[PDB]
Amino acid sequence: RINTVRGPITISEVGFTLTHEHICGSSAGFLRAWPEFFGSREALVEKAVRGLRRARAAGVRTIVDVSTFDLGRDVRLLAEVSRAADVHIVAATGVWLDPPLSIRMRSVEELTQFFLREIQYGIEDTGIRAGIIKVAITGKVTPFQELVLRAAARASLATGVPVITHTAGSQRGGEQQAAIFESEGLSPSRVCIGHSDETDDLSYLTALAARGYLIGLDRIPHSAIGLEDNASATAFMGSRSWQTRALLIKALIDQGYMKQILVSNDWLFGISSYVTNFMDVMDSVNPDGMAFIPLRVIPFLREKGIPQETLAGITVTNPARFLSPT
Amino acid sequence: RINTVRGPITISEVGFTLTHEHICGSSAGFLRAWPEFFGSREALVEKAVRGLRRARAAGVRTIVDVSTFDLGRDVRLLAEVSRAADVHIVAATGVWLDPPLSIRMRSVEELTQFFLREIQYGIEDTGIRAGIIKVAITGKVTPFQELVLRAAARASLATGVPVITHTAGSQRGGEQQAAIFESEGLSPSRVCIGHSDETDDLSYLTALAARGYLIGLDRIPHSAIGLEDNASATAFMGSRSWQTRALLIKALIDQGYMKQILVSNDWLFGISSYVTNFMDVMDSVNPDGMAFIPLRVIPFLREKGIPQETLAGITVTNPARFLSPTL
Ligand SMILES: CCCCCCP(=O)(O)Oc1ccc2ccccc2c1
Ligand SMILES: [Zn+2]
Ligand SMILES: [Zn+2]
Ligand SMILES: [Zn+2]
Ligand SMILES: [Zn+2]
Ligand SMILES: [Zn+2]
Numbered sequence: 001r002i003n004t005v006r007g008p009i010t011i012s013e014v015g016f017t018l019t020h021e022h023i024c025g026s027s028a029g030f031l032r033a034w035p036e037f038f039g040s041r042e043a044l045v046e047k048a049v050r051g052l053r054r055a056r057a058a059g060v061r062t063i064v065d066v067s068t069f070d071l072g073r074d075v076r077l078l079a080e081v082s083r084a085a086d087v088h089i090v091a092a093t094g095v096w097l098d099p100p101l102s103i104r105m106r107s108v109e110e111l112t113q114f115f116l117r118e119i120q121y122g123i124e125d126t127g128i129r130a131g132i133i134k135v136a137i138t139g140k141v142t143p144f145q146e147l148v149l150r151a152a153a154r155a156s157l158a159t160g161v162p163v164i165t166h167t168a169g170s171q172r173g174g175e176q177q178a179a180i181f182e183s184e185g186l187s188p189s190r191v192c193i194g195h196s197d198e199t200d201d202l203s204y205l206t207a208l209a210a211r212g213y214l215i216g217l218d219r220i221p222h223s224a225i226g227l228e229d230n231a232s233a234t235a236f237m238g239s240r241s242w243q244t245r246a247l248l249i250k251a252l253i254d255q256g257y258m259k260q261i262l263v264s265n266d267w268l269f270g271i272s273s274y275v276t277n278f279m280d281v282m283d284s285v286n287p288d289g290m291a292f293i294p295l296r297v298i299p300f301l302r303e304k305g306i307p308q309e310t311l312a313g314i315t316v317t318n319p320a321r322f323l324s325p326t
Numbered sequence: 327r328i329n330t331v332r333g334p335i336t337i338s339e340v341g342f343t344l345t346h347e348h349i350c351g352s353s354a355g356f357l358r359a360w361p362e363f364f365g366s367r368e369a370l371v372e373k374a375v376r377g378l379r380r381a382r383a384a385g386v387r388t389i390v391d392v393s394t395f396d397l398g399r400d401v402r403l404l405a406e407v408s409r410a411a412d413v414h415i416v417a418a419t420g421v422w423l424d425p426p427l428s429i430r431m432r433s434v435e436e437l438t439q440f441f442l443r444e445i446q447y448g449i450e451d452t453g454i455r456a457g458i459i460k461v462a463i464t465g466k467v468t469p470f471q472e473l474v475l476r477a478a479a480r481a482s483l484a485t486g487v488p489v490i491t492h493t494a495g496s497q498r499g500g501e502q503q504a505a506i507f508e509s510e511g512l513s514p515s516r517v518c519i520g521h522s523d524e525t526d527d528l529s530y531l532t533a534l535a536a537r538g539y540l541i542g543l544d545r546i547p548h549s550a551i552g553l554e555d556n557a558s559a560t561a562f563m564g565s566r567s568w569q570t571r572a573l574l575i576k577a578l579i580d581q582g583y584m585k586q587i588l589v590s591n592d593w594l595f596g597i598s599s600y601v602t603n604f605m606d607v608m609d610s611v612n613p614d615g616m617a618f619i620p621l622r623v624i625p626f627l628r629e630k631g632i633p634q635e636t637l638a639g640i641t642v643t644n645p646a647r648f649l650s651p652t653l
């Protein structure tokens with residue numbers, strides 16, 4: 001069974017899953033301290049519920065919200081939105097790229113215990129347990145990021161819960177992360193190397209897939225094309241089209257890797273961790289939001305000749321195998 | 327009136343005040359996400375209540391908790407401990423040295439609104455309103471720190487609440503905070519230059535006091551050494567003696583500046599933003615906690631011949647003048 005913000009669900013109940021999404025990109029405590037940054041908590045809930053309900057109408061049954069403590073994960077927000085939209089949400093533990101001092105001063109043993117608290121006991125006082133561990137690196141893994149990766153591996157070996165990563169920007173960091181994970185004895189089948197659609201290097205992707213890693217092509221809608229005059233947009237969403245991103249799904253299917261592929265939008269309903277009103281720029285590129293994958297990518301891949309069955313395998317079977325604890 | 331975590335109090339209720347303290351040094355959301363770091367929330371509350379009751383029995387009536395959002399301020403913790411200890415606590419807005427992205431991406435105008443929300447409306451959902459604005463800088467003030475200082479000046483000018491600031495990693499640089507604050511039209515009498523006991527340069531402190539700034543000699547018990555192993559202990563407390571620090575209080579008095587002096591401990595009852603078990607290092611060097619000022623420093627100054635009336639001016643009158651909102 002998989003833990004969600006509404007409690008445990010069976011695999012059969014998971015259904016069509018977007019495995020890399022967020023309700024709100026933020027910082028720890030920030031939504032509680034300054035909800036009016038989002039116009040109000042109530043407005044952000046309403047936006048999230050309308051968006052998830054549109055995704056649900058397009059067939060989405062589950063999302064995995066990969067926001068960690070330091071991305072401002074608010075598990076009560078997740079719970080409210082999950083229940084109102086009636087879509088399963090899996091919450092996350094782990095450490096993203098903006099740890100505060102109380103996180104970044106911690107040893108590997110301490111970080112392991114924090115992730116275990118979140119998976120085993122619950123998040124804060126809520127009893128809501130994490131279903132995935134999210135980690136991130138920049139460039140070359142920093143000493144602190146290596147501690148986070150080792151703690152993630154150890155928490156996953158203890159609980160069976162999977163790890164999702166990424167490397168900041170379009171740097172291809174999977175091989176360095178995979179080295180660390182394997183040094184801890186973590187099976188590749190527990191690890192998704194995320195934001196892998198940021199690169200065209202198919203040799204890099206195929207080799208990771210061939211080792212049994214899951215490949216997150218999780219950014220598909222993010223494109224700054226047409227937004228060339230917005231330098232903040234280009235830095236966040238890149239210059240590659242969504243079709244270019246989507247064709248990596250095809251390329252990996254064609255190389256025999258369909259079982260290793262996880263697809264998502266990396267969308268959200270509010271963001272405070274970047275420039276002000278960035279959500280508006282995002283919303284203007286992808287008015288579909290989280291429904292982008294079912295509504296637009298899926299038919300795109302069918303049209304390129306991929307079998308509905310192979311698409312169902314990527315969007316249903318792969319996420320269930322990935323999320324079910326081992 | 328002055329806002330506290332229990333509501334508004336009158337000037338005459340403020341009493342002997344420690345103007346630079348913390349209940350817990352932490353990070354935003356951390357005490358809620360990992361209270362077992364502190365052994366438990368229940369354990370942190372008990373320790374804080376005992377420590378504030380000790381300070382109270384030593385004559386303390388009010389503390390100012392200068393912890394900002396990014397220092398992990400939990401106003402519900404402050405309200406709980408203030409009630410159980412019967413010591414008023416004034417809470418803070420502002421930005422310390424660990425702003426997360428959602429803060430460090432903000433403009434001066436946005437930060438001004440955030441500080442105004444916490445002063446005028448309340449902190450989080452609690453209705454508890456900040457009574458001071460805390461800001462911090464390093465080195466040569468960074469561009470982001472300059473934004474924070476100007477937003478603080480604008481929030482103070484709109485509400486009358488004062489500003490407490492310091493320069494981390496050096497023993498001067500109040501001159502940087504002063505130039506920026508004055509460029510915004512802020513009166514120096516609304517500003518305390520904190521951690522001023524870290525320097526031995528008295529001409530520097532006297533020149534700020536002559537301009538009307540208040541001088542925080544607020545780190546007095548952090549002098550302590552004897553721990554020559556720890557890079558941690560020294561890189562944070564340092565190598566001087568507390569007496570030498572306390573003598574800066576007498577030095578400013580002798581220069582005619584008694585009205586400009588605020589004294590405190592910069593203590594806390596939990597700390598997660600540095601090395602694990604740093605709290606135990608701090609408690610071993612200063613087992614008096616927040617009672618160190620009234621139990622050690624005040625009698626030391628008395629024995630150096632400072633009169634009662636002067637010591638009451640520093641500990642009672644100056645903090646009430648500082649904290650009372652004055653536009
Ligand atoms: C800066 C705050 C955004 C919060 C979203 C967290 P994310 O890391 O999963 O989203 C991003 C945000 C920007 C990215 C830029 C290049 C490559 C991948 C990127 C992923
Ligand atoms: Zn990411
Ligand atoms: Zn992502
Ligand atoms: Zn993401
Ligand atoms: Zn300080
Ligand atoms: Zn201080």
Ligand SMILES: [Zn+2]
Nearest residue numbers: 347348392592
């Ligand atoms: Zn302090």
